[PDB]
């Protein structure tokens, strides 16, 4: 089997990142592609 998959997971709009939680996607965008101010 493959080392990664799309499955039923959420994906980043800016890079090749994926996660099972929408909260983890929000935290990824808010810290990696945007910042807290
Ligand atoms: Zn990303």
Curated annotation (Swiss-Prot):
Location of this chain's protein in the cell: Nucleus; Cytoplasm, Cytosol
Zinc finger (C2H2-type) residue numbers: 10-33
Tissue expr: Isoform 1 is strongly expressed in placenta, spleen, kidney, testis and peripheral blood leukocytes. Expressed in CD4+ and CD8+ T-cells, CD19+ B-cells and CB14+ monocytes. Isoform 3 is strongly expressed in placenta, ovary, tonsil, CD19+ B-cells and CD14+ monocytes.
Taxonomy, superkingdom: Eukaryota
Binding-site residues, Zn(2+) 3: 12, 15, 28, 33
Function: May be involved in transcriptional regulation. Overexpression causes down-regulation of a number of genes involved in the immune response. Some genes are also up-regulated.
Protein name listed in UniProt: Zinc finger protein ZFAT
Organism classification: Eukaryota, Metazoa, Chordata, Craniata, Vertebrata
Gene label: ZFAT
Residues of the whole record sequence present: 323 to 353 of 1243
